[PDB]
């Protein structure tokens, strides 16, 4: 079953406008293989990822997830972004953490220009439990059962400097891939769209 | 201790004429701050020796 897992599949989509303040939170990523937000109107289908179908037939999941953020700039769109993973569970007030407070956590920066445009972010396995239950199968919150090993805010680390004959915004695809992935305790569950 | 802390950030414009002082920032005093990770090593200590890596 490692075929539909390691191949990067689009999980989310967010742009990056030039009219934003430095340090403004763009989009958080709840770090789990269960995450997807796309759909389609022709045909009427909720777009799953190929990793979200493998792990949804299990209780527990474990593995070093590799997020691949493919920006689509020109060569001259300049600036940098911040992909700051904050571990723990799916629910902490990470929106209240300031940008310089987010410099305490380990993270990475990426120049929008350059000769490449995709950053492979290998998420560490940071959890209190050695696995993580499919709490989406259940319908109740409980301290001890959770869904994610942490969240991942895309910050505005630098502004987007560009001329007027190019675009004012650069869109970022969120690929979903992994390495050393393990799941057990099988079940059947259809996942629902994380509506952010 | 060896992890980069964003101690300052600015925005340089066109209206700043030649040799205008855009930023006047202190190095170690902005490092000694509660919102960073080195506060857990500098609050319980008083006298220190260190080298500064600016990026």
């Amino acid at each position: 079953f490692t075929t539909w897992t390691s191949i990067p599949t689009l999980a989310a989509q967010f742009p990056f406008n030039a009219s934003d303040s430095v340090g403004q939170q763009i989009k958080v990523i709840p770090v789990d293989p269960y995450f997807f937000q796309m759909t389609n109107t022709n045909p009427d289908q909720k777009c799953i990822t190929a990793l979200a179908s493998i792990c949804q037939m299990f209780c527990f999941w474990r593995g070093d997830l590799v997020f691949d953020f493919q920006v689509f700039p020109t060569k001259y769109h300049s600036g940098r972004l911040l992909f700051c993973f904050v571990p723990g569970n799916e629910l902490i007030d990470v929106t209240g953490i300031t940008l310089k407070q987010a410099t305490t956590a380990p993270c990475a920066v990426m120049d929008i220009a350059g000769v490449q445009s995709t950053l492979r972010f290998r998420v560490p396995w940071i959890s209190d439990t050695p696995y993580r239950v499919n709490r989406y199968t259940k319908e109740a919150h409980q301290k001890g059962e959770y869904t994610a090993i942490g969240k991942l805010i895309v910050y505005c680390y630098n502004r987007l400097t560009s001329p007027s004959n190019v675009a004012h915004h650069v869109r970022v695809n969120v690929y979903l891939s992994a390495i050393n992935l393990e799941c057990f305790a099988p079940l059947y569950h259809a996942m629902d769209v994380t509506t952010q | 201790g060896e992890k980069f802390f964003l101690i300052h950030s600015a925005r340089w414009l066109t209206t700043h004429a030649l040799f205008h002082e855009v930023a006047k920032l202190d190095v170690v005093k902005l490092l000694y701050n509660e919102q960073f990770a080195v506060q857990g090593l500098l609050r319980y200590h008083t006298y220190a020796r260190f080298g500064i890596e600016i990026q």
Partner: antibody
Amino acid sequence: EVKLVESGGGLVKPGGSLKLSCAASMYNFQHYGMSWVRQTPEKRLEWVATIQTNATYTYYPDSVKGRFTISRDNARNILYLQMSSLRSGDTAMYYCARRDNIECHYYFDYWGQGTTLTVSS
Amino acid sequence: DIVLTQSPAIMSASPGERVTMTCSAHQYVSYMHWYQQKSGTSPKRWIYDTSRLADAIPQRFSGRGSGTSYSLTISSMEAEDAATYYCQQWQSNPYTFGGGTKLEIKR
């Protein structure tokens, strides 16, 4: 475009209760902290309430701590500012704000059109 | 707790000259944020942390000063600034604003 439409306000006797509501538009709800800014016609301004994305954290000043209640909803994306024990100190224009993050401090980006609550009997 | 003090209360200036307003406090605040309350509408994105203008206003404005004094340097006055200004802190609990700076046009 941010369309923050307040709802509420009018003629409420002092000591009464009235709940406000500010709806979000075209942008994500689980990031941007929502607030309320009171606009008195003579002086100002006093800042009253904020509950964040997770509903655990509330931040009130010395004055309106415990008398006003701000709430958020992930389903409708509409605020709920429940007010009680009003008087002439709150007879003003009410705006709803949206608080995002900068390097050291925060900022309120986009504000609404504002509704009028007159508190007298 | 802490109270912000704006020294220009009511000012009127001809279009095409330099205007500087100042918001101070009784203690030391780090960064100061500004707004513009036009008639009939609400304040929008105007000024963030120290010299960080908005991304939709013209760039003929500036903001300097640290510690006590906080100058907002206007390079060239124009006919679009007939409104009321406020200054914002982000230190301790009440998050108070300034008393109000009404800048107008001299005729």
